[PDB]
């Protein structure tokens, strides 16, 4: 039985990075060789596991986190990184065991006049823990004066939209990212390679 990796990579809509979606992959057989030996991915880096050995390794569960970030922000999707996305939107643990896949999606996620459907979190009181999702839209209180949920002086909306225009430079173009995390849980392996 094949794994529904097409539902993740070939999905019509991708989530914003602040509200990144996670798909549980289980009870199927995954062939990771085709993904690494593909020619549609601009970024394919793995940590703690060799890309070739994935096809002869078993894991309890596999999680596919997908989102869209800027081009120059893809470097932040890695262990031991800091930045707007890594500190406030999506943080990988320092012991990350998995692969980070990204590809340019300017032809899908960029609209004429600007696609303002993708968002990112501007700031957070504390940095995100690894694999922590923050979908709160409460108004950040920078000052002592309370905000009472109204934008104004010292009261700012925490989310900002990407100005994804087709004329932007490559570093500012939308990039779809898929983070495959491999879980070494003490349970029977529900996903393996063609070993």
């Amino acid at each position, epitope marked *: 039985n094949l794994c529904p990796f097409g539902e993740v990579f070939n999905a019509t809509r991708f989530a914003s990075v602040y509200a990144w979606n996670r798909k549980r992959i289980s009870n199927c057989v995954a062939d990771y060789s085709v993904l690494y030996n593909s020619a549609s991915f601009s970024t394919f880096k793995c940590y703690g596991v060799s890309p070739t050995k994935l096809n002869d390794l078993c894991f309890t569960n596999v999680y596919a986190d997908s989102f869209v970030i800027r081009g120059d922000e893809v470097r932040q999707i890695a262990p031991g990184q800091t930045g707007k996305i890594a500190d406030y939107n999506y943080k990988l643990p320092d012991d990350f065991t998995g692969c980070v896949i990204a590809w340019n999606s300017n032809n899908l996620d960029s609209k004429v006049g600007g696609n303002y459907n993708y968002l990112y979190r501007l700031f957070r009181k504390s940095n995100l823990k690894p694999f922590e999702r923050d979908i709160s839209t409460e108004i950040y209180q920078a000052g002592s004066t309370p905000c009472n949920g109204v934008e104004g002086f*010292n009261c700012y909306f925490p989310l900002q939209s990407y100005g994804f225009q087709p004329t932007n430079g490559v570093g500012y173009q939308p990039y779809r990212v898929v983070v495959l995390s491999f879980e070494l849980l003490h349970a029977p392996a529900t996903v393996c390679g063609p070993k």
Partner: antibody
């Protein structure tokens, strides 16, 4: 230590527009609150507006709303103030001020660091 | 808006004597939750930008000498210089940062009494 460097003095014909810069040389920039305080010759201090650059949204005084535009460039640590539809009374020194605290802490808008000032003279 | 009124416009004090400056706010700047007053005092010598002296109406900024003191709560505030020095001749402003718009006082000119 850290100092705020502002653009040079300018002369503008009445009815025109002026844009004044304020570059922060030293330290973090996005997490602070940068305000623009005006002082007409011989008069007191007048708050025009400010911005916390990381949030991009500026807060102005209602008096100048529609005439003043305060922005910031997070990549160059520079805060801008553009005052359009200039009048004779707008002739003053424009100061740039930074809050004492950064964004992770509580940013209350009292200012410990100031720029030496930018003189804008509006006359025929 | 919270109007800030200072009194007097100017005062003359001899060297080594006490100088007191008043600041009146049209609305109370004492937040009930923090029990602290959102008022700051500045000093502006001629030709220079303002210099922060006091914040929270009683707390001195680092580097400000001990001769400067701030007292008051609510709407009535006072800046006091215990012994006036030659390098203290300036204009002193009070500012509120409780709500926008941020408003300054009219300023108070301190001059040497001769």
């Amino acid at each position: 230590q850290v100092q705020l460097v502002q653009s040079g003095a300018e002369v503008k014909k009445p009815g025109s527009s002026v844009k004044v810069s304020c570059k922060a040389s030293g330290g973090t920039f996005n997490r602070y609150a940068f305000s623009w305080v005006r002082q007409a010759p011989g008069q007191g201090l007048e708050w025009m507006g400010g911005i916390i650059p990381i949030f991009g949204t500026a807060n102005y005084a209602q008096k100048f709303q529609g005439r003043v535009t305060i922005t910031a460039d997070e990549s160059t640590s520079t805060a801008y103030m553009e005052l359009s539809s200039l009048r004779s009374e707008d002739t003053a020194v424009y100061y740039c001020a930074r809050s004492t605290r950064e964004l992770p802490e509580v940013v209350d808008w009292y200012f410990d660091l100031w720029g030496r000032g930018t003189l804008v003279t509006v006359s025929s | 808006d919270i109007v800030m009124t200072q009194s007097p416009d100017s005062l003359a004090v001899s060297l080594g004597e006490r100088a007191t400056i008043n600041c009146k706010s049209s609305q109370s700047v004492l937040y009930s939750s923090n029990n602290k007053n959102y008022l700051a005092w500045y000093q502006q010598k001629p030709g220079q930008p303002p210099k922060l002296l006091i914040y929270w109406a009683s707390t001195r900024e680092s580097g400000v000498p001990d001769r400067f003191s701030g007292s008051g709560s609510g709407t009535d505030f006072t800046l006091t210089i215990s012994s006036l020095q030659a390098e203290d001749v300036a204009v002193y402003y009070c500012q509120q940062y409780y709500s926008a718009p941020l408003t300054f006082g009219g300023g108070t000119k301190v001059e040497i009494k001769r």
